[PDB]
Amino acid sequence: AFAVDAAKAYKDYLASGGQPITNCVKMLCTHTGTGQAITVTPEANMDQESFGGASCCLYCRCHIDHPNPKGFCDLKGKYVQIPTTCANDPVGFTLKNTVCTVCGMWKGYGCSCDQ
Amino acid sequence: SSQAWQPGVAMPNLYKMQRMLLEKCDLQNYGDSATLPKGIMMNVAKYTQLCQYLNTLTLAVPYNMRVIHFGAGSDKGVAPGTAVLRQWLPTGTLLVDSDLNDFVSDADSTLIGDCATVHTANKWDLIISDMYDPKTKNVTKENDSKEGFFTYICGFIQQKLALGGSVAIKITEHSWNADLYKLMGHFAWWTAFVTNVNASSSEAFLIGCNYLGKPREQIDGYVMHANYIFWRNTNPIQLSSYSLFDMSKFPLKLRGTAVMSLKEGQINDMILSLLSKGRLIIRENNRVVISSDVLVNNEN
Numbered sequence: 485a486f487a488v489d490a491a492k493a494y495k496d497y498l499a500s501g502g503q504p505i506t507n508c509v510k511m512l513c514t515h516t517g518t519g520q521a522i523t524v525t526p527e528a529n530m531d532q533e534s535f536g537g538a539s540c541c542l543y544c545r546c547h548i549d550h551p552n553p554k555g556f557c558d559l560k561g562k563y564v565q566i567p568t569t570c571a572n573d574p575v576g577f578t579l580k581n582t583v584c585t586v587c588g589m590w591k592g593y594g595c596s597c598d599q
Numbered sequence: 600s601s602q603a604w605q606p607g608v609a610m611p612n613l614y615k616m617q618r619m620l621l622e623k624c625d626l627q628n629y630g631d632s633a634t635l636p637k638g639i640m641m642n643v644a645k646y647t648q649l650c651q652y653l654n655t656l657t658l659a660v661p662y663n664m665r666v667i668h669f670g671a672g673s674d675k676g677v678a679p680g681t682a683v684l685r686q687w688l689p690t691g692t693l694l695v696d697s698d699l700n701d702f703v704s705d706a707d708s709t710l711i712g713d714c715a716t717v718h719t720a721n722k723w724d725l726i727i728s729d730m731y732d733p734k735t736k737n738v739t740k741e742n743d744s745k746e747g748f749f750t751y752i753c754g755f756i757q758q759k760l761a762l763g764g765s766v767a768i769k770i771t772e773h774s775w776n777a778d779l780y781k782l783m784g785h786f787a788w789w790t791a792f793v794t795n796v797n798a799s800s801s802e803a804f805l806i807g808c809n810y811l812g813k814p815r816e817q818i819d820g821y822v823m824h825a826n827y828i829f830w831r832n833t834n835p836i837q838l839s840s841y842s843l844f845d846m847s848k849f850p851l852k853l854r855g856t857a858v859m860s861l862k863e864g865q866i867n868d869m870i871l872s873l874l875s876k877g878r879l880i881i882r883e884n885n886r887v888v889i890s891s892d893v894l895v896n897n898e899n
């Protein structure tokens with residue numbers, strides 16, 4: 485029943501003061517995009533930065549299997565929008581948060597479907 | 600000059616027509632660096648300006664476009680140039696990248712190994728190469744035409760670049776190949792492009808625009824590299840990040856360029872004219888299949 489739990493390790497590592505994973509690939513863009521979480525092209529709004537998706541995936545960056553039973557990656561080959569206040573740690577951000585299946589925004593960082 | 604507000608500078612045509620002897624490259628602005636926007640890597644900026652410049656040329660942009668990117672990995676294990684290329688290229692463009700060492704990529708497929716191990720069944724609409732060995736920056740020995748991966752690239756272009764396709768191949772003062780310059784004369788137009796963010800370096804991208812599959816002009820590659828160095832040696836380029844701040848017109852326009860399968864006997868002057876104007880791609884539209892050779896050893 486053993487499997488490495490990489491998401492837990494990174495969370496505990498961060499909590500004990502570890503420096504976030506660096507070299508996530510930040511894109512140049514207009515910052516007038518839709519602000520949706522994961523997109524086929526950079527979509528940062530004024531309050532976001534856009535990053536190459538694979539460089540923000542914990543599993544891609546660590547050379548480990550994805551928890552998708554098919555091993556498919558949500559981020560690779562796409563662009564992830566990260567709130568500028570959290571752009572010091574895109575990998576930690578994408579791991580800890582979830583995209584709204586209705587409107588495509590980050591829950592609590594753009595999604596207003598609960599009003 | 601208004602060159603600071605452009606993505607970079609292309610080699611002026613009059614420098615292409617000279618017969619200079621090869622000299623040492625001595626850049627006035629050597630060792631300076633451009634001020635990059637907050638948190639932007641040099642390679643994101645460099646590829647962004649390269650793509651901004653390619654937006655001004657007559658690139659063919661078919662449906663189901665096929666782009667291959669050599670030397671795509673960085674010291675950091677990621678692929679910044681690939682991410683910019685994917686942003687620039689129309690959505691759905693098949694993007695393959697490759698490098699000698701392992702890296703994490705947004706490309707649709709990634710081949711790890713020496714580029715000479717890379718084989719593809721299909722032809723390509725655009726070849727980008729950032730391959731570079733820094734062990735070539737040896738100022739104490741003569742500066743000869745280099746082989747290595749340049750030999751592969753010349754063969755790859757002649758065998759696997761669709762007619763009408765384009766290339767952008769990174770060179771420096773010491774990292775260059777005479778046959779690659781000769782091959783620029785097999786395109787309808789060519790230049791050497793220096794990005795404004797990296798203008799303090801002898802780096803340029805050697806760009807062949809719309810491949811014709813035959814010599815349109817005869818270029819002596821040794822003389823042309825000397826002409827390139829002469830241009831750099833006498834034209835300081837002011838470092839500039841200005842163009843990085845306007846991305847509104849960045850995406851490559853999906854021109855839907857026609858693709859046709861034609862045999863050599865069918866490429867007449869009218870076809871060659873369409874190829875030259877960025878209005879035609881000649882290749883099959885089959886499935887894209889790649890592989891890398893693997894040497895097998897048992898060290899026991």
Ligand SMILES: C[S@@+](CC[C@H](N)C(=O)[O-])C[C@H]1O[C@@H](n2cnc3c(N)ncnc32)[C@H](O)[C@@H]1O
Nearest residue numbers: 642670671672673680699713714729730731748
């Ligand atoms: C200037 S770095 C490219 C960095 C990358 N393009 C980026 O966006 O940051 C040059 C790359 O060319 C690669 N290279 C040099 N010789 C090669 C060869 N013979 N086959 C494949 N790759 C090679 C190196 O491994 C190195 O990563």
Ligand SMILES: Cn1c(=O)c2c(ncn2CCCl)n(C)c1=O
Nearest residue numbers: 624625626627629738772800801
């Ligand atoms: C290694 N290298 C240099 O030392 C240099 C230079 N431009 C001026 N210098 C100073 C010595 Cl002339 N370039 C382009 C270069 O590649």
Ligand SMILES: [Zn+2]
Nearest residue numbers: 541543544557
């Ligand atoms: Zn991943």
Ligand SMILES: [Zn+2]
Nearest residue numbers: 584587595597
């Ligand atoms: Zn929502």
